Amino acid sequence: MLLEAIFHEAKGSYAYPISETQLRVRLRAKKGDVVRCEVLYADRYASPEEELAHALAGKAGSDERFDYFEALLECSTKRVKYVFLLTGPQGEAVYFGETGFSAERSKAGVFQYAYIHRSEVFTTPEWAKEAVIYQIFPERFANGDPSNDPPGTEQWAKDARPRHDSFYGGDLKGVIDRLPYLEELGVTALYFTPIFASPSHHKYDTADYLAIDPQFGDLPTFRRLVDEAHRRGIKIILDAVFNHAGDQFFAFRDVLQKGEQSRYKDWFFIEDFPVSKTSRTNYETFAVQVPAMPKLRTENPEVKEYLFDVARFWMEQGIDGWRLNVANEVDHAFWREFRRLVKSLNPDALIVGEIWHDASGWLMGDQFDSVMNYLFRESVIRFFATGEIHAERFDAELTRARMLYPEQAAQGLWNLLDSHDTERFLTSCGGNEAKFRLAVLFQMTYLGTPLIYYGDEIGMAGATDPDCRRPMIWEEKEQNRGLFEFYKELIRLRHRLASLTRGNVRSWHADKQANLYAFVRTVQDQHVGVVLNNRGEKQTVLLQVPESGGKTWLDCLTGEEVHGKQGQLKLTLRPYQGMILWNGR
Numbered sequence: 001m002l003l004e005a006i007f008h009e010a011k012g013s014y015a016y017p018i019s020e021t022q023l024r025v026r027l028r029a030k031k032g033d034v035v036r037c038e039v040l041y042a043d044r045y046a047s048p049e050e051e052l053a054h055a056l057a058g059k060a061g062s063d064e065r066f067d068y069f070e071a072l073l074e075c076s077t078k079r080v081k082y083v084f085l086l087t088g089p090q091g092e093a094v095y096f097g098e099t100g101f102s103a104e105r106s107k108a109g110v111f112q113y114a115y116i117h118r119s120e121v122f123t124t125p126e127w128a129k130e131a132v133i134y135q136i137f138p139e140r141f142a143n144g145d146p147s148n149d150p151p152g153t154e155q156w157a158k159d160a161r162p163r164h165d166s167f168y169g170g171d172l173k174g175v176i177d178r179l180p181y182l183e184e185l186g187v188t189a190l191y192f193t194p195i196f197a198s199p200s201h202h203k204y205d206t207a208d209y210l211a212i213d214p215q216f217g218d219l220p221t222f223r224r225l226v227d228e229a230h231r232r233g234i235k236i237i238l239d240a241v242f243n244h245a246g247d248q249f250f251a252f253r254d255v256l257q258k259g260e261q262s263r264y265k266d267w268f269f270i271e272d273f274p275v276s277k278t279s280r281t282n283y284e285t286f287a288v289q290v291p292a293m294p295k296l297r298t299e300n301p302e303v304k305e306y307l308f309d310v311a312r313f314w315m316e317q318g319i320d321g322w323r324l325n326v327a328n329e330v331d332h333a334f335w336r337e338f339r340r341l342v343k344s345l346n347p348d349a350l351i352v353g354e355i356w357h358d359a360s361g362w363l364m365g366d367q368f369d370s371v372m373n374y375l376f377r378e379s380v381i382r383f384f385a386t387g388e389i390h391a392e393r394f395d396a397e398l399t400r401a402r403m404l405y406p407e408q409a410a411q412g413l414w415n416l417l418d419s420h421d422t423e424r425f426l427t428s429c430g431g432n433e434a435k436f437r438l439a440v441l442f443q444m445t446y447l448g449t450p451l452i453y454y455g456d457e458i459g460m461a462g463a464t465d466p467d468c469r470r471p472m473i474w475e476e477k478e479q480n481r482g483l484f485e486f487y488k489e490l491i492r493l494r495h496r497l498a499s500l501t502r503g504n505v506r507s508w509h510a511d512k513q514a515n516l517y518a519f520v521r522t523v524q525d526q527h528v529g530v531v532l533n534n535r536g537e538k539q540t541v542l543l544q545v546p547e548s549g550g551k552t553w554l555d556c557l558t559g560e561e562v563h564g565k566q567g568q569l570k571l572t573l574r575p576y577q578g579m580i581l582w583n584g585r
């Protein structure tokens, strides 16, 4: 076996506790190199003559080039030292510990997870595990109050083509009026983009953190929205823009007026007063040269305190969590303290960071509960929309991404198809509803938390920002109701099958040729197999089905009963058809 490809570390995503006395450990090796991975462990202060505990690590998955082995160590002492025993296809074996590799156990040394502190057990809100989030971009969802529309508001139509500066009049009253629609859809939480006072249509350039934007409503209206959503089983998640403020933020206004004399100059990153010759801003902003968004010095204890007060204030209004804007650009300490603040105020308040790349550094348990899973989106785009990758590659990307973070984070990752910053998924699919639906079937059944971008459920399309922010289509005749019912059915199923919300995931079948992909969600004895025929042709496949897991399944989408013969299951799928096979347990 290639030792150069074997890896483990007693931290991060390769070793972390799932309870005060249980440690999950993982190990990767070149794919196919290891057939058996066992862990020999004991208390860190155990005498050398003491017997060692054994734990067999099962193969939790395989990506492009590695196999991932996973085991659970029972550590009643909460302190553990361990070594791996790896066996190859031909029986060759080697011990692997902190010191290195050796045929002699003691020479391999031992990895050590010093101590398991209860406070360090990554814990997320239970509800977040089985939730289906719906993203609402307020200026474009529903205009329930035409009297607060910004000046220049354009007419609400299906052929509307917005510009970066357009306004359509969407507001919070509109959201309230449409709660029956969201409730019928079955969503259990709403993620709102910024709703605080701001002169723009997107509101990411904050004028006042303590006020609902006038064109969206007021405090009383927001509170009514929170209460009405809650009674309909719908939670509220607000967008926290803590990386940067708007040029109209009171502290910045003071800087523009008093220059180096303002008491708030250190709340920002300023280079040379006068505060501005704007084309070449003399203060750091979000991205490049964006005068409206001066970056906040969150490292400044004063800035932090102010923002923490803002969070406290809104949480006092009954919200259920936060989506953190450009979260990877404010400091880690700020986030560790934020989590402590948030969880101390509401143990069930959800913290979701907005990071598009590998966010493992923020997902170890001391900061965010989850992140907007843009890498999940990349795989889905690649496999279902563009067809850049085949089923086996798709399987590998999914598995590799899943192994990047501890299971607690993976379990609640926000799996979106698109957002207000991308083109709509339908468009990515080139208008092919068949491709779109199979992707949605995957979104609704894969491991993680589904996030729906407003309008996708009724067939809206659009290029990226600002075209992805077209006013919501409310005319029934203009809505794709067939799609709407499809979403409704998938959402009801997700709520009915515990496997889909609290189960693990294992690849079932992956054939690069037929481009058919299948996985199994498991919890207890329940198994739900999802089969995806991502091809424009009718195909038949043979899936392996050991009788120990059942020999009869019910396709929950059609009611058809399928049966396995001698450990094999023959399925025939129409083009782009997906099946959700429940094993009746």
Ligand SMILES: OC[C@H]1O[C@H](OC[C@H]2O[C@H](O[C@H]3[C@H](O)[C@@H](O)[C@@H](O[C@H]4[C@H](O)[C@@H](O)[C@@H](O[C@H]5[C@H](O)[C@@H](O)[C@@H](O)O[C@@H]5CO)O[C@@H]4CO[C@H]4O[C@H](CO)[C@@H](O)[C@H](O)[C@H]4O)O[C@@H]3CO)[C@H](O)[C@@H](O)[C@@H]2O)[C@H](O)[C@@H](O)[C@@H]1O
Pocket: 164, 200, 202, 204, 205, 286, 287, 288, 289, 290, 292, 293, 325, 326, 327, 354, 356, 357, 420, 421, 465
């Ligand atoms: O620039 C002139 C413009 O300035 C103001 O408006 C700016 C911008 O403000 C708003 O954008 C917000 C998003 O809506 C949020 O979701 C979020 O998105 C950021 C994200 O947090 C960043 O990490 C980054 O994303 C990168 C990603 O990190 C990277 O891995 C890779 O995937 O590329 C991503 C970019 O696609 O940028 C996101 C914003 O993207 C947009 O802005 C970029 C900067 O110019 C641009 O390159 C990109 O094409 C855009 O899609 O955080 C931002 C917070 O600002 C608002 O919704 C946007 O519509 C606005 O453009 C003024 O208000 C505006 O009048 C003026 O025209």
Ligand SMILES: [Ca+2]
Pocket: 143, 144, 145, 146, 147, 148, 149, 169, 170, 171, 215
């Ligand atoms: Ca309005």
